[PDB]
Design a protein around this ligand. Structure first.
Ligand code: 3MB
Length: 350
């Protein structure tokens, strides 16, 4: 049997749940009959990104419609889709292309989860749960619900829940202290930077085996820079609300996972509108999309020397901005050090 605490056991079962992987793929409209979980390969996903990159270029620059049709056909042949009784939409709309780039970001993590799940499981002297946990190469520990650490985090969750996102409440079911192998080490150089903050990162439960084993990562070289509002970086938020939405939970599936990572922001390059950033200006370490609301700078605390913006959602003096809430982007995978993983229960208003 498992040596791990129950909460952790329940966490492992959840992140390695095969049915959840299929549900995700079905939602992205993949054809599970022609494209089963076992057919997914990294090479396959890379090719798909390139195709999306080319089609994106042809739509922007006014390429032949014959070009766009051929690119669509190759994309749907590479990744079989099931549109039911409707005709398959062409990759000729920039919004639809962005949706498809998002889908591939997810398939990248699902592919990792499945590969690990089918990996070295022969050992009979270990419980299945224990074997998969070790595959994550991440030391996971339960944070004592009553300790100061937990109190601060519960405060961060409660206070930063936005007004417009109050279509659901949020209950912190469990808090885990996570420490990925080799991460503290690659992050070391950035402790020299100032403006290090504890920020939020939401994602589907299906991406977590990938997130824990490989860490958060920037999109590959093949992905169009256009598929992302501020370019190919790693995104974070200061309002639990903003990130929580990326968990993709529902009335039918209410438990989501969310990360709290220490992020070395340094001098932020502040923006009010989208910009497909490739190069970061000299002297800037990150990007900050400004929002109309943000935690009250008054209430900002520290936790082990890292700033925690746990203040209440106060409106900022900026009005000429497209964003409702702040977004922080780092363009170097070493600029983040994951700290906690929270098991959240989304309570929907009905
Ligand atoms: C893509 O834009 C964002 C912006 C801010 C946070 C997140 C997230 N996944 O937690 C994503």
């Amino acid at each position: 049997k498992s040596k791990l605490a129950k909460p952790i056991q329940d966490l492992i079962k959840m992140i390695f749940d095969v049915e959840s992987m299929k549900k995700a793929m079905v939602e992205f409209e993949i054809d599970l009959q022609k494209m089963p979980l076992g057919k997914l390969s990294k090479r396959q996903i890379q090719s798909a990104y390139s195709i999306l990159n080319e089609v994106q270029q042809a739509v922007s620059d006014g390429g032949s419609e014959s070009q766009i049709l051929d690119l669509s056909n190759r994309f749907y042949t590479l990744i079989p889709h099931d549109f039911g009784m409707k005709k398959p939409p062409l990759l000729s709309n920039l919004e639809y292309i962005q949706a498809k780039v998002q889908m591939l970001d997810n398939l990248l993590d699902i592919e990792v989860a499945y590969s690990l799940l089918r990996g070295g499981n022969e050992d009979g002297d270990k419980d299945p749960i224990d074997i998969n946990y070790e595959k994550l190469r991440t030391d996971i520990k339960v944070v004592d619900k009553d300790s100061e650490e937990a109190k601060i985090i519960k405060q961060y969750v409660k206070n930063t829940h936005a007004a417009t996102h109050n279509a659901y409440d949020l209950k912190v079911v469990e808090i885990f202290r996570i420490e990925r192998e080799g991460e503290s080490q690659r992050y070391k150089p950035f402790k020299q930077l100032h403006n290090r903050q504890l920020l939020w990162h939401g994602s589907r439960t299906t991406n977590f085996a990938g997130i824990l084993s490989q860490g958060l990562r920037i999109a590959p070289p093949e992905a169009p820079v256009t598929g992302y509002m501020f370019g190919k970086g790693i995104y974070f938020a200061d309002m639990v609300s903003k990130s929580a939405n990326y968990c993709h939970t529902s009335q039918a599936d209410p438990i989501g996972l969310i990360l709290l990572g220490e992020v070395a922001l340094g001098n932020m390059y502040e923006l009010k509108n989208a910009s497909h950033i490739t190069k970061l200006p000299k002297g800037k370490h990150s990007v900050k999309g400004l929002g109309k609301t943000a935690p009250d700078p008054t209430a900002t605390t520290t936790l082990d020397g890292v700033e925690v913006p746990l203040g209440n959602g106060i409106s900022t003096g900026i009005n000429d901005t497209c964003l409702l809430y702040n977004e922080y982007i780092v363009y170097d995978v070493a600029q983040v050090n994951l700290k906690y993983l929270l098991k959240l229960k989304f309570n929907y208003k009905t």
